[PDB]
Design an enzyme around this catalytic site. Structure first.
Site: not given
Lengths: 6, 282
Positions: B184-185
């Protein structure tokens, strides 16, 4: 933080 | 009251040297970064639930077998300190500078290190992951668009708003994909490398806060934002993920707006200003 998302 | 916390750590972990130790602090929790160990101490009784949260995410991620390290709970969660603490491993290694990642003699190796992790993430047992992790919500980008129009649109030029509407729209248009583990990051700062016999090896991935069952395109987007299309094209070639390009670009076109919106919400003036520079003339 940052342009990636952080 | 870092004096108390330090005593809590000395008492529970006598041999930990807190001389020259990181401190991250927040409204949320304090973190003491020692050599081999991270101590997290929540500040509220509600923030305390973050500790079993972190254990459950990191355990679930570790069980997928990515072939690279992730932070490991080194202790059970403890009800010592004000609101508990957790001891996690510190992973060693350094983010790959963009110039290094892309040299012709290493770019194939860097591409396969990303590919083999992303392939293990795409092949996770999603039925097991969905009991523990967040699951990508179909409503996510509609809601994000709503908050961007409420908080940021007034600060933009008319050209800013036109650009932001097309970027929001490309994300809102995506069909819902929840087919594997997503970090997600997955920008460069969360990915740690070592020179292993004079070639880069991807040894660790940290900061699993945004982790979910979701769309693999979202991690490829982050790799592209850190390292450029020369790297992500090679990763996508290896994975056979050429279908994902439209999704990859739709994630990437939201990154500046995600940063701006988080700068507003978190009260970081520099993140807000930096995320908005494409959306106004001043």
């Amino acid at each position: 933080k940052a342009x990636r998302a952080a | 009251t870092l004096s108390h916390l330090v005593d809590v750590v000395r008492r529970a972990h006598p041999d930990v040297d807190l001389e020259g130790a990181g401190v991250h602090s927040g409204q949320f929790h304090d973190v003491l970064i020692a050599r081999d160990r991270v101590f997290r101490f929540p500040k509220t009784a509600g923030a305390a639930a973050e500790l079993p949260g972190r254990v459950a995410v990191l355990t679930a991620v570790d069980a997928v077998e990515l072939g690279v390290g992730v932070p490991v709970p080194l202790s059970e969660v403890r009800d010592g300190g004000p609101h508990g603490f957790l001891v996690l491993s510190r992973l060693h290694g350094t983010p790959l500078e963009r110039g290094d990642a892309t040299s012709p003699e290493v770019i194939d190796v860097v591409a396969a290190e990303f590919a083999r992790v992303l392939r293990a993430m795409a092949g996770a047992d999603v039925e097991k992951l969905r009991l523990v992790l967040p699951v990508a919500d179909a409503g996510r980008w509609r809601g994000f668009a709503g908050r961007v129009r409420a908080t940021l649109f007034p600060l933009m030029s008319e050209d800013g708003r036109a650009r932001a509407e097309r970027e929001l729209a490309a994300a809102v248009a995506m069909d819902h994909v929840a087919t594997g583990l997503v970090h997600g990051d997955l920008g460069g700062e969360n990915v740690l490398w070592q020179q292993v016999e004079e070639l880069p090896r991807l040894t660790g991935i940290v900061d699993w806060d945004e982790a979910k069952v979701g769309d693999p395109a979202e991690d490829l987007a982050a790799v592209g934002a850190s390292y450029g299309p020369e790297l992500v094209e090679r990763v996508v070639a290896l994975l056979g993920a050429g279908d994902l390009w439209p999704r990859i670009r739709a994630y990437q076109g939201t990154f500046a707006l995600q940063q701006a919106l988080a700068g507003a919400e978190d009260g970081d003036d520099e993140e807000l200003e930096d995320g908005l520079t494409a959306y106004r003339k001043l």
